[PDB]
Design a protein around this ligand. Sequence first.
Ligand SMILES: C[n+]1cc2c3c(ccc2c2ccc4cc5c(cc4c21)OCO5)OCO3
Ligand SMILES: C[n+]1cc2c3c(ccc2c2ccc4cc5c(cc4c21)OCO5)OCO3
Length: 575
Amino acid sequence: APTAPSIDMYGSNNLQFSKIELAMETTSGYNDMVKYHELAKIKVKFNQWSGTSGDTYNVYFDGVKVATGAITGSQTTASFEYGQGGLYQMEIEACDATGCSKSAPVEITIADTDGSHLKPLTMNVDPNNKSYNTDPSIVMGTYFVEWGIYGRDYTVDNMPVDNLTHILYGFIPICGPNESVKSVGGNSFNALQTACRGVNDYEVVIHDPWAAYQKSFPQAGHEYSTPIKGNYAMLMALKQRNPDLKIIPSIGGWTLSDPFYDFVDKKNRDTFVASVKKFLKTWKFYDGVDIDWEFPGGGGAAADKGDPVNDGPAYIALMRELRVMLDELEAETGRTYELTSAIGVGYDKIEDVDYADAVQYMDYIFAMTYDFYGGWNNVPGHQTALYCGSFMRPGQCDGGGVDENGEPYKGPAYTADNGIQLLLAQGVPANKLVLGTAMYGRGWEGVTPDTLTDPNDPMTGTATGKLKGSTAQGVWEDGVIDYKGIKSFMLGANNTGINGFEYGYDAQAEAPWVWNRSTGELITFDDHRSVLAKGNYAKSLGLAGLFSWEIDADNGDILNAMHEGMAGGVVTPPN
Ligand SMILES: C[n+]1cc2c3c(ccc2c2ccc4cc5c(cc4c21)OCO5)OCO3
Ligand SMILES: C[n+]1cc2c3c(ccc2c2ccc4cc5c(cc4c21)OCO5)OCO3
């Protein structure tokens, strides 16, 4: 028989092959950093220094023949293409008319972006996240933010994955106009300009390739030379652990929506939709797309953008066109892909889209039932309430009244139910609506007892400015505090108030607050009671479930309350 091939491990890239080529120690344009191949190029060198070499080689993966070729004397390179990622035991055999002889088996890795080469992720979840057996029909969603791996020190293996159905990854930018990104300061705008170098306008890109696929996470077993690292390799390993989990890229958001206003021109929609198809072919762990345009008709970060006439029909066309494209991917792959969108729920945001037309293309609408009131001005109110609070004036709730100046309200007040009922009354099906819960508070200072028109209710006061604090307190921006910061610095373990704060609850609105009457610090948030009220409301109206912004800010209490409030319930999944 021929001499058995001896595999040259270092001549064959120690048997590590990848379908994706990712640049590693540089930051450049997206199309220069990311190159995906439908088939991996496998090149394995072997030698046969003694004896006869034979005529032909065969390569086996786990005892199955996957390639064959000619022997070339004493040193041969087996070259072939392979599609399916995984870890395989490889043997190389040499054959001639006298017989065949085979190398010892050795493990070969073919990396792919579905995580097929990876073991299930090792988790490190805060144990205050509890176990539930919520029915698998109900949505339990959250947003994981790409930058939460920095100061917030919250990584993919911290997520309480068994308590989630959907993880929306915030956020994928669109190349083009992006002045709003400069409002976050720091290097966000410049990092986008780098990502977009050599990329056509209106195509998606990864904003932070260090966080997405370059950073080595030791908890995930990453080495500097591992071919895919970052949050994305951890999400691929998480999908191996929990295969029914849906992980969906969220495109846009508050700071990244400026390009959507040019989608009134179909040519820019076509560029965008094609780039999303390419993105989902490149990054296989993703299960759909979420469109967070804030907002059709304007009222978002860009004060000079928004067209009430034209943006709704553009949004609807976008959804139509994305569902055509996702149907093409479903034909090509055999997979199911979801199309979702997070939307404003103030009456003035809902009126700018005919959701009765859009929702036929969509699996879910994530209703942004939060940010109703906040530190952008000095008017207290409930930022995430279901219903109208005690603080509101007569006729403010339904918008028939007049304000303190005598001027008509322009529409119903900002509450979750006023927006959910506007959506239901136009025919959006309840079982496509997902209710938002806040894992943060918004707040003010200067709300001292002398400013209250009703002494029992601090939401009748007036502020002097935004809540101030430090990042150790969960205050990453003035006026906004992580829930886990409110619990550590204002509520305490028994939920009865520490550090000079008192807890209160507006039972009409279903909304909690903490108030320090000495500093005038007042914070509006969601807590166990108000999240149980949202779950009861969702069960009552047959909504699809609940989601939250943002998972790094919880300590487990808010996601536990989301499950607790949904106990016993089931829903019909959208078809
Ligand atoms: C995109 N980034 C990169 C960062 C970063 C840091 C620290 C903070 C950030 C950051 C903080 C807040 C952000 C907020 C954002 C954002 C991006 C960021 C953001 O885009 C959407 O709104 O050290 C390395 O790189
Ligand atoms: C000014 N801002 C910044 C935001 C923001 C976010 C998320 C939401 C907001 C936001 C939401 C509602 C708002 C409503 C407003 C406003 C500002 C905002 C507002 O000014 C007038 O009424 O992550 C980046 O930064």
